[PDB]
Paper text:
These variants constitute the Phosphotriesterase Selected Variants group (PteSV). Variant W263F is the most proficient (kcat/KM = 1.21 (±0.26)x104 M-1s-1), followed by W263M and W263L with increased efficiencies of 23.3, 14.1 and 4.6-fold, respectively, as compared to wild-type enzyme. Regarding the PteSV group, while these variants exhibit higher phosphotriesterase activity, they demonstrate mild improvements for the oxo-lactones and no or wild-type-like AHLase activity (W263L-M and W263F, respectively). The analysis of the normalized B-factors of the variants clearly reveal that the substitution W263 is destabilizing (as confirmed by the Tm of the variants), but also that the active site loops of PteSV are significantly more disordered than those of LacSV. PteSV lose their activity before the loss of the global structure (Tm), whereas LacSV do not, and exhibit a similar thermophilicity profile to that of the wild-type enzyme. These data strongly suggest that the increased disorder in loop 8 caused by the PteSV substitutions collapses the loop as the temperature increase, whereas it does not occur with the LacSV.
The catalytic center contained two metal cations coordinated by four histidines, an aspartic acid and a carboxylated lysine residue. A structural analysis of SsoPox, a hyperthermostable counterpart of the PLL family from Sulfolobus solfataricus, has revealed that loop 7 is shorter in SsoPox than in PTEs; linking the active site to the loop 8, which forms a hydrophobic channel that accommodates AHLs aliphatic chain. Indeed, W263 is located at the start of loop 8, involved in the dimer interface of the enzyme and positions the lactone cycle of the substrate onto the bi-metallic catalytic center.
Residue numbers in the entry:
A (entry chain A), B (entry chain C): 1 to 314
The structure:
Amino acid sequence: MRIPLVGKDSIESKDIGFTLIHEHLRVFSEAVRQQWPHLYNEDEEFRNAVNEVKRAMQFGVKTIVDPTVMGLGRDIRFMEKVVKATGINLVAGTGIYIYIDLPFYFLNRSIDEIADLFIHDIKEGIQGTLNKAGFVKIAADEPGITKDVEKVIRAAAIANKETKVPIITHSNAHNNTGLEQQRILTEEGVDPGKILIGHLGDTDNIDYIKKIADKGSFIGLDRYGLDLFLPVDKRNETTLRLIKDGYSDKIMISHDYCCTIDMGTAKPEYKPKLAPRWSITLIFEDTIPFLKRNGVNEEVIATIFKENPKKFFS
Amino acid sequence: MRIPLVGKDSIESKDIGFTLIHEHLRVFSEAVRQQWPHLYNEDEEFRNAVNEVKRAMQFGVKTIVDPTVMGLGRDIRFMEKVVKATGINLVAGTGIYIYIDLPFYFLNRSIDEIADLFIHDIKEGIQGTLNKAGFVKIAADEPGITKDVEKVIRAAAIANKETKVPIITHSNAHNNTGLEQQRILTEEGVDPGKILIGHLGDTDNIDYIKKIADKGSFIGLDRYGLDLFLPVDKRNETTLRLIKDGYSDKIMISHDYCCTIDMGTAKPEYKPKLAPRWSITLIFEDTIPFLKRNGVNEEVIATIFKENPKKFFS
Ligand SMILES: [Co+2]
Ligand SMILES: [Co+2]
Ligand SMILES: [Fe+2]
Ligand SMILES: [Fe+2]
């Protein structure tokens, strides 16, 4: 059809339905898990992911896009288990997630070599399976656009032009990395409407967010629940403002929730402090009702969670 | 019963025999191999490692110390397959190999949690097996002693003090990282004679190397064949000079040979220029005969390849 799904036949974009554009079933450092498996519990990770997905589906979620890639512990076999146990539409991706340098493997390897890896996942399949990647994920954070971060961005552009799959990014909302990602990608021939600039919800700087949307890319208000980056009420005020200003056409919303994450920051005794209400269904429990209370109609909600994702994968 | 071996009973350190203190059976980036297995061929890797180790045993090598740790693709099960096919004494280690930052797993984690990881490998076993680590490996390079790099160094100190296993390091011969590693470790209470400061053979700056040995640590003239860091003839000159100046009892010699390495820098095309005669037996073909034809007696060669490793692990 058009959009590949983990453990299912691919579907036309018209069948995506209500979508969460940025959620993680599970995240871990590949090297750590590989060297110290005693630190992880496969059964527990599985129960948590299955339980989260089931609750999301009870609110009407039909598709989840999971941008777990190299550097975040992408595991296509774990994903297909969750799919088999829930019946969710799951879009997996390919890409590379780094802030500074690439793994030593890429020393003296061209940008084309890197792009070949993405294209392989898109055309052949992921990690020895026939499950194909439906988008490319790239990142940049506090260190900005370093040389290697820039190789990865250009590689994504190459993969997009060859395969037409969209691009999701991770960025730091406070240092201009999002704007730079969009610039570099679009200068390399990527259609701006095929890019989602991520974690823009981490800021309340409306002008910066409009600046990116105005250049034709989707804007990721995609960390709902992560108060440490920005409280739910601040995000809500920003989201409502953008909607009132007529930016529904570019807004995408999600939680960036990790049904499991191995970071030292994601410890249970830090949850009440940094992400008390953080879950894969927080937007149903708070954000969406807040928007409706403030005069946002059902057409707008549908545009954000249905039409936008559809255009993005079309 | 003192030095753990992979796939064998532990040995007394006095039984170690002729030893190669720094060689790799296989090296790769965990994240890359995990996300793109299509890039690797395990049969070739296994065949290459077995062939190299067998040729090494033909030259009288009894023991090989393999500092492949997190970040370099340590794989204890691959290692025991190689032992079963060769009968070599193989010492595995634990530790972390980074130049700049630690994997995100380590955000908000203490130096002690890191040490616990090393201590787990040494006392419990590696990757779910009963094969135990016989030393701790750490690294620092061009980027220098970063915060994360230092945290790892200090973790290694804790592990040494708890388990008594020696410490092997990777350093950059031109930026003082070696001397820094030695300083931080000794300050933390690590016996200098329990430290092998690695890759010092990459420079002909005899003064720098001597300073480190004078501080009481072993010096790694351990990259024989890697001409891109320093040609074999210049290495041999430094080695011979250090021996004549009476540093035999602090010198350790090796190849740092990777029977298989995944990085593009060390791939077939560049080998003829960067490392034309680089293998696990180069020192028997070139280095040792050079030393012996230049007034180095058999007692000195035994001190370097038998006595020094014995002390290091005592
Ligand atoms: Co992100
Ligand atoms: Co090294
Ligand atoms: Fe994410
Ligand atoms: Fe090495």
